[PDB]
Amino acid sequence: GITVLTHSELSAEIGVTDSIVVSSELVMPYTVGTWLRGVAANWSKYSWLSVRYTYIPSCPSSTAGSIHMGFQYNMANTVPVSVNQLSNLRGYVSGQVWSGSAGLCFINGTRCSDTSTAISTTLDVSKLGKKWYPYKTSADYATAVGVDVNIATPLVPARLVIALLDGSSSTAVAAGRIYCTYTIQMIEPTASA
Amino acid sequence: GITVLTHSELSAEIGVTDSIVVSSELVMPYTVGTWLRGVAANWSKYSWLSVRYTYIPSCPSSTAGSIHMGFQYNMANTVPVSVNQLSNLRGYVSGQVWSGSAGLCFINGTRCSDTSTAISTTLDVSKLGKKWYPYKTSADYATAVGVDVNIATPLVPARLVIALLDGSSSTAVAAGRIYCTYTIQMIEPTASA
Amino acid sequence: GITVLTHSELSAEIGVTDSIVVSSELVMPYTVGTWLRGVAANWSKYSWLSVRYTYIPSCPSSTAGSIHMGFQYNMANTVPVSVNQLSNLRGYVSGQVWSGSAGLCFINGTRCSDTSTAISTTLDVSKLGKKWYPYKTSADYATAVGVDVNIATPLVPARLVIALLDGSSSTAVAAGRIYCTYTIQMIEPTASA
Amino acid sequence: GITVLTHSELSAEIGVTDSIVVSSELVMPYTVGTWLRGVAANWSKYSWLSVRYTYIPSCPSSTAGSIHMGFQYNMANTVPVSVNQLSNLRGYVSGQVWSGSAGLCFINGTRCSDTSTAISTTLDVSKLGKKWYPYKTSADYATAVGVDVNIATPLVPARLVIALLDGSSSTAVAAGRIYCTYTIQMIEPTASA
Amino acid sequence: GITVLTHSELSAEIGVTDSIVVSSELVMPYTVGTWLRGVAANWSKYSWLSVRYTYIPSCPSSTAGSIHMGFQYNMANTVPVSVNQLSNLRGYVSGQVWSGSAGLCFINGTRCSDTSTAISTTLDVSKLGKKWYPYKTSADYATAVGVDVNIATPLVPARLVIALLDGSSSTAVAAGRIYCTYTIQMIEPTASA
Amino acid sequence: GITVLTHSELSAEIGVTDSIVVSSELVMPYTVGTWLRGVAANWSKYSWLSVRYTYIPSCPSSTAGSIHMGFQYNMANTVPVSVNQLSNLRGYVSGQVWSGSAGLCFINGTRCSDTSTAISTTLDVSKLGKKWYPYKTSADYATAVGVDVNIATPLVPARLVIALLDGSSSTAVAAGRIYCTYTIQMIEPTASA
């Protein structure tokens, strides 16, 4: 009684400053993207079969800046604050804000040739707490976290950490964007939102 | 009694501005390019065997800007207005306005090696309404659409959506151009135009 | 790039009067049921893989009344007005308003044993106009029909006709309900509703 | 040069009284049902490949009454007047006016499981006078019978006898209806009617 | 649930004048011939399995005149006006108004030997819009065409074009006649006409 | 070190009113039945191998009313309030309050023949949060739920929802009863209660 959905949509717009800026995002259907958020809502639980975040530049060979991203599994630990820490995560990847062109074949959804330039990272999945996770909202999670940091600890499978520094302007500069390419399993349907 | 034609010609000149600009183009022989327009006209119906739009840069590593394109099958839906929406289409592809050099082997018509940089998208074909479509003009279509948005809905197989933003000048800048590489099937000949 | 969904939800509440009452319902995702309506909306086109309407009684062995239902493929023809006509349709089925208990194994989604009592009918599917149909609303369809009865003719695959007579009261009596058990194919995602 | 047609339509509405009421019906295309009557008319001769009459209740578990039916091959013999006589026919069947639900799978046109409840009877076919019978009207037959009861004897293959008694009201009560499920062979086309 | 019918009846009387006269005829059951018109009406949809128009002379070796005929698939295009255009159609055939004797074996419905003289043309069938077409009347079609020339475009599979010139008298002369030899598939029965 | 227990006892008495009445019950050993409650208590954890709730009528063919039941896995979601919602659950089943006689072979614990009439539903088990659940009391659960609706979320595997409507009296009428037929796994024994 499992509905399997595989799709890739824009996940987030990226910009670079001269000072490091670490951002985090839960890896729930409700957040990987506007579309899935709506679809997945129609099911009470779900399970990631594969979740990949891929960065695609939109700037010039001239643009200063680097992007870093990786996954955190123990939602308990404080979110990284340095490239150093970030570099220790699983599936960590670093690249110049204008590189990553090659990752396209991941969003594209085709056969990948030379993906050595690619700035994409996939989820560990096997190292996840449980199999079926409940569909939750930022609000829902944000509230449960505000009780026992451990009560929330198992509502979302993992978080994606992103760090952007080495920029040229103190004012954000359009570097590119991340696209999530997921394959989800959804079970037990219910009422939308 | 099918005449098969495979050819690739220039499809459109591309330019980038700082504000997003979404453009659409029907995927009929009459529009993919000046040449096919004339040839295909000599046949009453046709069927796409394969239609691929490929972008080839003509700017510098220095040029700011990104190009996005994908296909729409339900000619009924409103044309995308954001990269986000556009990113949801089938065969969506995004790249820096100066990248895509590698796609050449598609226009070139040879053996493709590393096409991970490539900014090309091919038509779904199997998800098309019918098999044989009638040859129609922009004028012809534009008129039929101006009656029942559904009467036109099946005259053209699909539309190609293109979005160009992240530019540097408020005044269009020559970024590159798209080339359509089609393989068409034409049946029942008639009088030109 | 096809998302396959199989599910069964309540489709409609049934009631019987002494005078015949023929009702019709389009066989679009938007109408087979509240849930699918919402889900399927997230896709621009779809295709029925299997659509079965099953009636399940909720009345007594004592309840007078019979239910009749079948499918119409040429959306053009006037909707039946008599059991006689209705009896000519494909997959026509007739039964006592309190029978049909056995059809449960269709909603249930299990192995069916003795389904001779069953008041269920499945869609012909192979005799459908095209493969991929566009997602449309009652409103959308009702408007297009109000132009060329033929423009709408191909927006929905087929209609389900239902007739209820042989009742005991001139005032509707709760006889049972119909449940749609569909397996749909959805393609090209878009913005909800 | 044989056109084969298999279809099942409503054949007759049934009602029960307290006193026995025997009814007869010829087994010609012109009488098994409104539809076939029209279709078959377009052919000069025809041959039954299979003819089955099936009763489907529409009353309650509470309804008093029984239905009886069988076939007569020697159109010469006087039509039965008692259940006893009727019980001697080929394919005789008796059942409670509210039973027979299971016969549906015969009209339905599917795979039959438990058809022990079923109130259906099929034609002997092999024991028929000739192979090809001429298409005739009630009027046509009624006139030829009014000459030599033997001249008509070979215009129709057989007659269906039906007896309804054990009712509760002296005034007919809606018990159910019979549906003919035929497979006919038609030859030598001519002008309709 | 498909009823297959194969039959051949007179389709039209032919006559020749000295000036060219192009005639067209839709390829619907309602028009290929009086008989099928009536029969096929009893079904809501149908599909041509094979449709062949054959000309049989009835004039003398002395009769001046030629007949031309072919099929048009894009019901949209203007009907031919010259033998030249007509000659471009699929299955075009030309012959002397008194030739074609050999085509008989097509109406006859037997084994064909030397059919090189034959003035017959068969329908392309595989190049048809859809599979199942709705049964429509000249009136029905003529009305729908009088709205969106495209709304009618898919109600009939194709049209047969016929041109008669090279005659000897300014007043039509009996040259022969065309006979349609069809094999149709009919589905979903309904009420005649 | 696993003790396996398979048994079936009465789970609950059912009654019908004219207004819908939705009831819920946790699927813990402590609630499926008086007996298991006591036995299972002697073990600290347990795991459902199979849990089936079966309804058995005790009323007449004359009794008005229908029963509906299904499972909820995301203990978080609000309990259904309509047959419609309820109909969306996994293993949903609906039947007339006097039907379900056939389900007996489930309680009986024998070979099942024709279980198409059966009003029984089994637990999904594979879609459960974890494997080993702790033995908890209504009180224990009711208290933990009264803190973080998520802290309780994983103490019980799933809940059974039941809806009874279409009744004849505003005052509950004895319709039948549900019997749970479980196969449990118990580990790590401790002190009773």
| Amino acid (one-letter) located at F40 | A
- B142 Cβ contact partners less than 8 Å away, ≥ 6 residues apart: none
Q: Do C77 and E148 touch (CB under 8 A)?
A: no
Residues of E in contact with C147 (CB under 8 A): 147
- Positive or negative CA dihedral for B99, B105, B106, B112? negative
Distance CA B164, CA B68 (A): 6
Residue among B96, B99, B112, B124 with most chain A CBs within 10 A, to mutate: B96
Residues of D in contact with C96 (CB under 8 A): 57-60, 98, 101
Residues of F in contact with A190 (CB under 8 A): 74, 77, 85, 88
> Which of the other chains make 3 or more beta carbon contacts under 8 angstroms with chain E?
B, C, D
For residue A4, the distance in angstroms to the closest alpha carbon of chain F comes to: 15
For residue C118, the distance in angstroms to the closest alpha carbon of chain A comes to: 23
- Look at residues E144, E150, E188, E190 and name the one whose alpha carbon lies nearest to residue E47: E188
Q: Do C87 and D9 touch (CB under 8 A)?
A: yes
10 Å CB burial of residue A171 (0-12, 13-18, 19+) is exposed
CA D186: distance to chain centroid?
19
User: What φ, ψ does residue E137 adopt, rounded to 5°?
Assistant: -100, 160
Element (H, E) at D85: helix D83-86
Smallest Cβ distance to A42: which of C3, C4, C39? C39
Distance CA B46, CA B125 (A): 13
> Which of the other chains make 3 or more beta carbon contacts under 8 angstroms with chain C?
A, B, D, E, F
User: What φ, ψ does residue A95 adopt, rounded to 5°?
Assistant: -165, 165
Q: Return the bridge partners of C17, or none.
A: none
- Positive or negative CA dihedral for D96, D97, D100, D106? positive
Distance CA F100, CA F61 (A): 12
Angle formed at CA D54 by CA D49 and CA D57, multiple of 5 degrees:
170
CA distances for D95 relative to B70, D69, D123, D163, D171, angstroms: 65, 10, 19, 11, 20
For residue E77, the distance in angstroms to the closest alpha carbon of chain D comes to: 36
Q: Do D104 and C116 touch (CB under 8 A)?
A: yes
CA B40: distance to chain centroid?
16
Distance CA E100, CA E57 (A): 6
Smallest Cβ distance to C77: which of E148, E154, E190? E190
CA distances for F140 relative to A2, E153, F29, F30, angstroms: 32, 71, 13, 11
Residues of C in contact with B153 (CB under 8 A): 134
SS3 E158: coil
DSSP state of D82: S
Tokens of F39: 């036995």
- B59 Cβ contact partners less than 8 Å away, ≥ 6 residues apart: B65, B97, B98, B173, B174, B175, B176
Alpha helices in chain E (DSSP H): 29-32, 34-41, 83-86, 104-108, 138-145, 149-152
| Amino acid (one-letter) located at D169 | S
| Amino acid (one-letter) located at C191 | A
Q: Return the bridge partners of A77, or none.
A: none
Residue of A nearest to B63 (CA): A60
| CATH number reported for the structural domain that contains residue E11 in this entry | 2.60.120.20
Residue of C nearest to F91 (CA): C108
| Amino acid (one-letter) located at C173 | V
Residue among B140, B143, B188, B192 with most chain E CBs within 10 A, to mutate: B188
Q: Do F90 and A1 touch (CB under 8 A)?
A: yes
How do strand B3-16 and strand B173-189 relate by DSSP bridges?
antiparallel
Site of tokens 């159910």? D176
Q: Do E39 and D42 touch (CB under 8 A)?
A: yes
Angle formed at CA F79 by CA F73 and CA F84, multiple of 5 degrees:
100
| Widest distance between CA atoms in chain B | 52
- E152 Cβ contact partners less than 8 Å away, ≥ 6 residues apart: C150, E75, E141, E144, E145
Distance CA B165, CA B176 (A): 14
* φ/ψ bin of B177: left (φ > 0), alpha (ψ from -120 to 50), beta (otherwise): beta
Beta strands (DSSP E) in chain E are 3-16, 21-26, 43-57, 66-72, 90-96, 119-122, 133-134, 159-165, 173-189
- Positive or negative CA dihedral for E111, E116, E118, E121? positive
Smallest Cβ distance to C59: which of F92, F96, F117? F96
Distance CA E119, CA E101 (A): 8
What domain count does chain C have?
A: 1
Residues of F in contact with A45 (CB under 8 A): 73-74, 127
Q: Do D3 and E4 touch (CB under 8 A)?
A: yes
Across the B/C interface, how many CB contacts are shorter than 8 Å? 47
C181 within 8 A of C109, measured Cβ to Cβ: yes
In a 13 Å sphere around the CA of B145, the CA atoms on its Cβ side amount to 13
Residues of F in contact with A141 (CB under 8 A): none
The residues of A whose Cβ lies within 8 A of any Cβ of C are: 1, 3-7, 35, 38-39, 42, 109, 189, 191-192
SS3 A177: strand
SS3 B79: coil
- A127 Cβ contact partners less than 8 Å away, ≥ 6 residues apart: A73, A90
SS3 A4: strand
SS3 D126: coil
Distance CA B97, CA B165 (A): 9
CA distances for F94 relative to E94, F86, F89, F177, angstroms: 69, 10, 12, 14
User: What φ, ψ does residue D135 adopt, rounded to 5°?
Assistant: -75, 125
Residue of E nearest to D110 (CA): E1
Distance CA C64, CA C16 (A): 8
Distance CA E32, CA E10 (A): 8
Distance CA A12, CA C92 (A): 52
F92 within 8 A of F86, measured Cβ to Cβ: yes
- Look at residues E171, E187, E175 and name the one whose alpha carbon lies nearest to residue E64: E175
Adjacency order of strands within the sheet including F159-165: F21-26, F159-165, F66-72, F90-96
Q: Do C7 and A35 touch (CB under 8 A)?
A: no
* φ/ψ bin of E101: left (φ > 0), alpha (ψ from -120 to 50), beta (otherwise): alpha
For residue E74, the distance in angstroms to the closest alpha carbon of chain D comes to: 32
Q: What is the CA radius of gyration of chain A?
A: 17
> Which of the other chains make 3 or more beta carbon contacts under 8 angstroms with chain D?
C, E
CA distances for B5 relative to B110, B132, B182, B186, F106, angstroms: 17, 15, 8, 8, 66
- Look at residues A174, A171, A179 and name the one whose alpha carbon lies nearest to residue A17: A171
Distance CA B132, CA B28 (A): 12
Nearest 10 degrees: Cα torsion B162, B166, B172, B174: -80
Tokens of F156: 């019980």
The residues of C whose Cβ lies within 8 A of any Cβ of A are: 1, 3-7, 35, 38-39, 42, 109, 189, 191-192
CA distances for C44 relative to A124, B128, C10, C141, angstroms: 32, 13, 24, 15
Q: Do A59 and B64 touch (CB under 8 A)?
A: yes
Q: Do F153 and A132 touch (CB under 8 A)?
A: no
Residues of A in contact with F151 (CB under 8 A): 148, 151
Residues of A in contact with F147 (CB under 8 A): 147
Which residues span the domain enclosing E25? Answer: 1-193
Tokens of A98: 């204008």
E178 within 8 A of E14, measured Cβ to Cβ: yes
Distance CA E31, CA E54 (A): 15
Tokens of F163: 């809806």
Residues of C in contact with A42 (CB under 8 A): 35, 38-39
- Look at residues C117, B36, E11, C173 and name the one whose alpha carbon lies nearest to residue D110: C117
Smallest Cβ distance to B74: which of C130, C134, C144? C134
Query: How far apart are the two ends of chain F, measured CA to CA in Å?
Result: 22
- Positive or negative CA dihedral for F60, F61, F62, F66? positive
Angle formed at CA B162 by CA B159 and CA B163, multiple of 5 degrees:
150
Distance CA E2, CA D133 (A): 24
Number of Cβ atoms within 10 Å of the Cβ of B96:
30
Residues of F in contact with C102 (CB under 8 A): 116-117
Distance CA B43, CA B190 (A): 6
> Which of the other chains make 3 or more beta carbon contacts under 8 angstroms with chain F?
A, C
Whether A contacts E, i.e. 3 or more CB pairs less than 8 A apart, is no
- Look at residues E124, E123, E117, E120 and name the one whose alpha carbon lies nearest to residue E107: E120
The residues of E whose Cβ lies within 8 A of any Cβ of B are: 72-74, 76-77, 85, 88-90, 124, 127, 129-130, 147-148, 150-151, 153-154
Query: How far apart are the two ends of chain C, measured CA to CA in Å?
Result: 22
Tokens of D122: 């099929």
SS3 E123: coil
Smallest Cβ distance to B45: which of E73, E85, E88? E73
Give the method of determination.
Answer: X-ray
| Amino acid (one-letter) located at B173 | V
DSSP state of E98: T
Distance CA F41, CA F191 (A): 8
Tokens of B81: 């207005």
Distance CA D51, CA F26 (A): 56
Residue of F nearest to C8 (CA): F88
Nearest 10 degrees: Cα torsion D55, D56, D57, D58: -130
Resolution (A): 3.4
- D60 Cβ contact partners less than 8 Å away, ≥ 6 residues apart: C61, C62, C63, C64, C96, C98, D98
| Amino acid (one-letter) located at E19 | S
Whether F contacts B, i.e. 3 or more CB pairs less than 8 A apart, is no
